[PDB]
């Protein structure tokens, strides 16, 4: 079962690199045991990504990935894997593991950048995978897949992709009830190599007449 | 004379022959030489070639073990790939388990341990390779040197192969903990080309690495503009 559970990760192409989103909560059920937990993961030279669903798992994958990073690293003889082969090897692990009906029970959005070939993809906790200009997991794919789908652009700046990066996750944060104010938007690029923002909060709209007054009355609300 | 035919005979001397039978393959192989420096570690071995054609950079004999410590083998390059990839399992093995950089001194313990378990098994050639370990750790750096009997031992100064007395009394000369890294490269370029035997081989080719803080404590080649340097260097000394 799935006990320290993460939520949306959602995923936008943009010019000159890649960016993800993801807020820092860790939900037990329904208490949000957790608001500090990093979930987000530079991997490897070229590559990015974050994952979803069980906390645990997710730490899993990343020892996996950094025995793999760095075996691959200790060859030195000039070639690495970029973001197509780390994220075909993540559908491997993940499809093997569901064959064994003892999944890894994370979605991960796995993304990046090599030779100026942009990649970014998703897999699930049962190896479905698809690769996409933007990738979503969880409410992230109701809530913000729709909003990705209507606004994104070929060549996104990287402050629209930030603007529109955040209004996908502030509409998650109005509507998700697993979603904590915190949250990172990682930023990759070529040349520049992976990059993730502080923690931060994003700022909430709540006055509208209509709330402070359900119906409307002098006496009843 | 029946007591030198395996490994687990015991001769009356007390000795057991076939671990100097790999000794002596050692010996015979090219140069490895190791420092440790004031604040790094610079290795630097002496491939030798025998063709023309052998494209510079080929069967490379320093080979990184981990992110934070490398290592440089003599004799059979075939058997030290073998200690090689047994020292990056247990690093790897060591970071799963307890989940922090495997200790220099574990590791260089560990893969003495484990070239000495090839020298217990009846069924087993024993390794004809020793090597050089000099990973960095935040106990600084740290050379070992490991010999195919299984005897490894933390050094100032290391070197293996045919060059091991010249390499020696070579480095006995030197002021180790004064002097640091883009030095080390000097003096290791100097001594190589001192110790080639032309009479003996012919164009060789001088590899080195080294773990510093300016390689913010990893392993990796150096620099080449420095190696050219520091042949240019060598060269004028041995004039």
């Not at chain 1, 990059?195 to 007449?209: D, G, Q, R």
């Not at chain 2, 390059?77 to 307890?98: C, L, M, P, W």
């Not at chain 2, 040197?145 to 030197?174: D, H």
Request: glycine share 10%.
């Amino acid at each position: 079962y799935p006990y320290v559970t993460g939520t949306s990760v959602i995923g936008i192409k943009y010019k000159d690199g890649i960016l993800i989103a993801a807020d820092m909560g860790g939900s037990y059920g329904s208490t949000l045991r957790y608001k500090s937990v990093e979930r987000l993961k530079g991997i490897g030279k070229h590559s990015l990504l974050g994952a979803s669903g069980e906390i645990s798992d997710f730490q899993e994958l990343l020892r996996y990935l950094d025995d793999l990073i760095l075996y691959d690293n200790m060859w030195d003889d000039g070639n690495s894997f970029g973001p197509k082969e780390v994220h075909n090897y993540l559908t491997r692990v993940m499809y093997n593991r569901r064959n064994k009906f003892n999944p890894l029970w994370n979605s991960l959005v796995l993304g990046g950048v090599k030779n100026g070939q942009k990649y970014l993809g998703t897999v699930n906790m049962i190896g479905v995978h698809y690769q996409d200009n933007h990738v979503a997991t969880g409410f992230g794919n109701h809530l913000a897949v729709p909003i990705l789908r209507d606004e994104w652009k070929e060549d996104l700046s990287f402050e629209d992709g930030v603007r529109l990066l955040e209004k996908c996750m502030r509409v998650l944060l109005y509507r998700d009830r697993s979603a904590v104010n915190k949250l990172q938007i990682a930023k990759i690029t070529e040349e520049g190599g992976v990059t993730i923002s502080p923690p931060y909060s994003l700022k909430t709209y709540w006055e509208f007449a209509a709330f402070k007054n359900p119906t409307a009355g002098a006496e009843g609300s | 004379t029946g007591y030198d035919l395996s490994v687990t005979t015991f001769s009356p001397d007390g000795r057991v022959f076939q671990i100097e039978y790999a000794a002596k393959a050692v010996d015979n192989s090219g140069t490895a030489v190791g420092i440790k420096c004031k604040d790094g570690i610079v290795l630097g071995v002496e491939k030798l070639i025998q063709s023309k054609m052998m494209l510079p950079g080929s069967n490379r004999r320093i080979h990184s073990v981990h992110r934070h410590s490398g290592m440089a083998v003599a004799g059979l390059a075939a058997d030290g790939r073998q200690i090689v990839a047994r020292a990056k399992s247990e690093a790897t093995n060591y970071e799963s388990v307890y989940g922090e950089a495997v200790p220099v001194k574990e590791l260089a313990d560990r893969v003495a341990s484990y070239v000495h378990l090839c020298t217990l098994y009846w069924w087993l050639r024993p390794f004809g390779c020793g090597v050089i370990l000099g990973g960095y750790d935040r106990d600084g750096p740290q050379l070992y040197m490991v010999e195919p009997s299984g005897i490894s031992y933390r050094y100032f100064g290391a070197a293996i192969g045919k060059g091991k007395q010249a390499a020696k009394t070579e480095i006995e000369k030197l002021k180790l903990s004064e002097m640091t890294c883009r030095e080390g490269i000097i003096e290791v370029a100097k001594i190589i080309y001192k110790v080639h035997d032309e009479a003996k081989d012919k164009a060789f080719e001088l590899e080195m690495s080294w773990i510093c803080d300016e390689s913010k404590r990893e392993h990796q080649k150096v620099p080449d503009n420095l190696l050219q340097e520091a042949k240019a260097a060598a060269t004028a000394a041995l004039e």
